[PDB]
Design a protein around this ligand. Structure first.
Ligand SMILES: [K+]
Ligand SMILES: [K+]
Ligand SMILES: [K+]
Ligand SMILES: [K+]
Ligand SMILES: [K+]
Ligand SMILES: [K+]
Ligand SMILES: [K+]
Ligand SMILES: [K+]
Ligand SMILES: [K+]
Ligand SMILES: [K+]
Ligand SMILES: [K+]
Ligand SMILES: [K+]
Ligand SMILES: [K+]
Ligand SMILES: [K+]
Ligand SMILES: [K+]
Ligand SMILES: [K+]
Ligand SMILES: [K+]
Ligand SMILES: [K+]
Ligand SMILES: [K+]
Ligand SMILES: [K+]
Ligand SMILES: [K+]
Ligand SMILES: [K+]
Ligand SMILES: [K+]
Ligand SMILES: [K+]
Ligand SMILES: [K+]
Ligand SMILES: [K+]
Ligand SMILES: [K+]
Ligand SMILES: [K+]
Ligand SMILES: [K+]
Ligand SMILES: [K+]
Ligand SMILES: [K+]
Ligand SMILES: [K+]
Ligand SMILES: [K+]
Ligand SMILES: [K+]
Ligand SMILES: [Mg+2]
Ligand SMILES: [Mg+2]
Ligand SMILES: [Mg+2]
Ligand SMILES: [Mg+2]
Ligand SMILES: [Mg+2]
Ligand SMILES: [Mg+2]
Ligand SMILES: [Mg+2]
Ligand SMILES: [Mg+2]
Ligand SMILES: [Mg+2]
Ligand SMILES: [Mg+2]
Ligand SMILES: [Mg+2]
Ligand SMILES: [Mg+2]
Ligand SMILES: [Mg+2]
Ligand SMILES: [Mg+2]
Ligand SMILES: [Mg+2]
Ligand SMILES: [Mg+2]
Ligand SMILES: [Mg+2]
Ligand SMILES: [Mg+2]
Ligand SMILES: [Mg+2]
Ligand SMILES: [Mg+2]
Ligand SMILES: [Mg+2]
Ligand SMILES: [Mg+2]
Ligand SMILES: [Mg+2]
Ligand SMILES: [Mg+2]
Ligand SMILES: [Mg+2]
Ligand SMILES: [Mg+2]
Lengths: 50, 87, 133
RNA sequence: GAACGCCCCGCCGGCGGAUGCCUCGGCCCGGGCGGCGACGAAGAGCGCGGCGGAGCGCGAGACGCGGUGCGGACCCGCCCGCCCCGAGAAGCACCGACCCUCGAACGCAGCGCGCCCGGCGCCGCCGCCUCGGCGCCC
RNA sequence: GGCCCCGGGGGCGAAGGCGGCGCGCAGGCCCCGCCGGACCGGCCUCUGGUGCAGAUCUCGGCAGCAGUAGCGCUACUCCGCGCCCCGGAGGACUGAGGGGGAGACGGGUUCCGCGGCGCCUGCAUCUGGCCGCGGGUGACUCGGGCCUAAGCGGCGGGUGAAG
RNA sequence: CGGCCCGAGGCGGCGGGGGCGACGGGCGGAACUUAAGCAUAUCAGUACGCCCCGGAGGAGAAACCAACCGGGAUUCCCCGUAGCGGCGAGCGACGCGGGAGGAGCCCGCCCCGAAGGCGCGCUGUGGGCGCCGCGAGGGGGCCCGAGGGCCCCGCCCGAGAGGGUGCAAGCCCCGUACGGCGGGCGAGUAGCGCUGCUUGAGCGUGCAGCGCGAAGGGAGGCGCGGCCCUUCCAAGGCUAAAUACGCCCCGGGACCGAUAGCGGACCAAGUAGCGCGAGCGAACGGUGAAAAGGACGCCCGGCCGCUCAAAAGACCUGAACCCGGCCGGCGCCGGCCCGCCGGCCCCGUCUCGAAACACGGACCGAGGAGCCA
């Protein structure tokens, strides 16, 4: 909606910011083979209830 | 038309975010939480669901204060501090 | 036979303690025997390995001698100078084959203020035991 | 007839993940312990790393700060930094502080507003200040 | 739990796997060759979550069928190295209750620029609401904050074993 | 106008509120089920809902039990039938006896009256286990990618519990055994009548509502009235121990070994994902001793080949079902060396009777049902 409360805006803002890949130097640093962050989401198939 | 067509009439929010437990369970029209019971002063807890009890309880969070008090008692100096005071 | 009942003799717990050890325990667990020449001079049997010592290797497929360039405490291994993986090119860099400290014997020790004192601390306790016995 | 199909006289390839061996995990019994909170708990939200998503941890002093002891060469990548008879990396134990919003949750509301220039919630006990009554009397 | 005559068999190759002889009425057992790469037992006594073809059994893999059944909204063509993308020229459509221009609710970054084709775009792709990297929403006058509607709370107290 | 009585607003110091899958205390309170039906009964004074503490809690120093040549507060352990009941199905205490542990006291009333905790009080105060640290003792020869292997000779042992280390280690390394620090006696009561629940309690085991309401009283496992005997003093209060238990830490096991064992062995499980919500809830362990994680060259991804004991190359081993290439051939039993002759309906099941036009079953793997008290 274009008319949203600041409290809903802030919780939506955090899901946008943390929706990221693992950095590549972290993959070298921590010696990882699983490289996908499975807590990511995509707007077409998500149901963020926030 | 009680099936697929009826589902296209949904553009409402029944529940929102609770200020106490954080879940998508606060009824916006009754002003009550269906998870923790807010604005009641006590927490909603039922013995007919022990799985619901283990999901949110003591220990599933930080325990930030209780952790420090126990380690001071078990191996720190707190049991000495009571003897000076309780005299 | 063990008598102390606060000490586990369970394989699962012992293996978990070799991993997940803190860093001060891991350093002690990476010890090696002193040579006979240093055993007479310092009156001590083993020492914890350290970056700067000279070691004589046996029992392995990479026998030799050299200085300790690195300590891989997570692996419980040490990299010695001159003991490398057989390389591909004639130019390319060396690659250290990592050695377990118990396959080594120390020939000369790195010395500083703390290492002199910890030796002397350890001789006086070993003389308490030699007076009790 | 050939080919397709089928059997295997044998030699090789696929697809799949059984069997065997392995185990920082479970389960059972026993012994300890029995230690939260208006001095703001349990729980929730948001934020914090030089390059930083998750989880652990921490709170605008934020991936930690100080003090006493101990320890004595490292700090998973790229860098920084430390290096010495003390100059002090990893690690450990106790102690002193910091401690954003919501929550028993405390000026009202839940994100917007006040009264007053310290501040400003409810109940109860003991005292104290200021008072009411054609209660009993003077 | 025991024994296995200088203290049972093992990298001079354990368990398992694939073929092939033998022994036993049989359940089954033993040996050899190849594979594999670290553990395994014969006899006596003890113990049990101890033997599968079926239960419209449970979970996992997977065949024939089979290159089979199948892929509303009038429509594209020529040239540009040319893709359903872009350009120019032509031919058509939606037909002002619009396949147009904008808000409310819901969604939550889908918006923009540059790059790109591993996934997706049930055909293709050089396209893209897909993937990587940077960015982006400015109010005395617009709305929210204020007022009250239908309602909903609160109120010395009242009631109920309490909630 | 002051005092006392009964109230109101404010201020200061102090206390309360919420939290827990156990154990503990107080209330409300089922139905499935069994009776081969079903109402009383049973399940069960249980599930679940509400309230309240603690490290334990509750209970407790006889208005007790008994019938003896007697015991003597409470709790816990061992031991065993009176009775209740459509007298059906079912249900069910206790004393004596043996042990663990053991501990006893107060207020009211009465006497003295402010002697007290003194802005109060004469409507009565006061007295009668965990923290430190040392820590012994093996070589030589064959062999392997690598010696913890094989052969032959020794040492330590208050230490041959065990973990690590390139392959089975007392003597390669950490530990293990042997030790130091802190250390004069209770009234709307007891009892009784009527009614509801509860108990083995049976003409009443315990509780309660309402009506009535004592003075010496209560009890003695069958009611009422009378006489004795035996034994206690209700209607007020405190109290250690022996007993019970999750979370969390510590040790142990004839337990499970990745479809098992917790739902959860995997840097991110009550997670990802699903539901308006209450709530539901997975799957996924293993390269090698060392990342040494793939040289040089040739064609335009492939070939050749490099590391390594080995590709083990995205990973241990790698079965079945099913499939592709090369090579050979055209269902079970029996005889013969071999494609002829002879015999042969689809199993499991219920059923007098199944090849049945009776039902289940495409195929393959792993799991899968008489155990325990
Ligand atoms: K907007
Ligand atoms: K969406
Ligand atoms: K419909
Ligand atoms: K609600
Ligand atoms: K078909
Ligand atoms: K593009
Ligand atoms: K009441
Ligand atoms: K009941
Ligand atoms: K019932
Ligand atoms: K019935
Ligand atoms: K019944
Ligand atoms: K009955
Ligand atoms: K009944
Ligand atoms: K009956
Ligand atoms: K006793
Ligand atoms: K070694
Ligand atoms: K009375
Ligand atoms: K009465
Ligand atoms: K009864
Ligand atoms: K009776
Ligand atoms: K009455
Ligand atoms: K009698
Ligand atoms: K009786
Ligand atoms: K009687
Ligand atoms: K599971
Ligand atoms: K049947
Ligand atoms: K039948
Ligand atoms: K029949
Ligand atoms: K049949
Ligand atoms: K038939
Ligand atoms: K047939
Ligand atoms: K039949
Ligand atoms: K039929
Ligand atoms: K059939
Ligand atoms: Mg309907
Ligand atoms: Mg509504
Ligand atoms: Mg993070
Ligand atoms: Mg507040
Ligand atoms: Mg078993
Ligand atoms: Mg079985
Ligand atoms: Mg089967
Ligand atoms: Mg037209
Ligand atoms: Mg775009
Ligand atoms: Mg396509
Ligand atoms: Mg205006
Ligand atoms: Mg006050
Ligand atoms: Mg039942
Ligand atoms: Mg019945
Ligand atoms: Mg029946
Ligand atoms: Mg019935
Ligand atoms: Mg009963
Ligand atoms: Mg008590
Ligand atoms: Mg009854
Ligand atoms: Mg009491
Ligand atoms: Mg499992
Ligand atoms: Mg393999
Ligand atoms: Mg029948
Ligand atoms: Mg049938
Ligand atoms: Mg069928
Ligand atoms: Mg099976």
């Amino acid at each position: 909606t274009a008319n949203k409360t600041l409290s809903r805006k802030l919780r939506l803002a955090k899901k946008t910011k943390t929706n990221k890949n693992i950095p590549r130097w972290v993959i070298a640093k921590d010696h990882l083979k699983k490289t996908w962050n499975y807590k990511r989401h995509h707007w077409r198939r998500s149901h963020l209830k926030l | 038309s009680k099936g697929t067509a009826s589902f296209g009439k949904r553009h409402t929010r029944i529940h929102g975010s609770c200020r106490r437990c954080g879940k998508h369970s606060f009824h916006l029209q009754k002003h009550e939480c269906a998870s923790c019971g807010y604005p009641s002063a006590k927490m909603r807890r039922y013995n007919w669901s022990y799985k619901s009890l283990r999901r949110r309880t003591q220990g599933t969070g930080s325990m930030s204060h209780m952790r420090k008090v126990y380690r001071a008692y078990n191996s720190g100096t707190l049991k000495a501090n009571a003897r000076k005071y309780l005299a | 036979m063990k008598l102390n009942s606060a000490v586990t003799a369970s394989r699962r717990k012992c293996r978990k303690a070799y991993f997940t050890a803190n860093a001060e325990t891991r350093a002690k667990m990476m010890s090696s025997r002193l040579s006979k020449e240093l055993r007479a001079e310092h009156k001590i049997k083993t020492m914890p390995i350290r970056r700067g010592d000279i070691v004589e290797i046996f029992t392995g497929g990479h026998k030799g001698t050299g200085k300790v360039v690195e300590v891989r405490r997570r692996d419980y291994k040490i990299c010695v100078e001159g003991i490398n993986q057989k390389a591909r090119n004639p130019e390319a860099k060396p690659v250290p084959y990592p050695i377990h400290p118990s396959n080594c014997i120390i020939k000369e020790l790195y010395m500083n203020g703390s290492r002199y004192r910890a030796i002397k601390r350890r001789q006086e306790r070993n003389a308490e035991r030699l007076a009790r016995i």
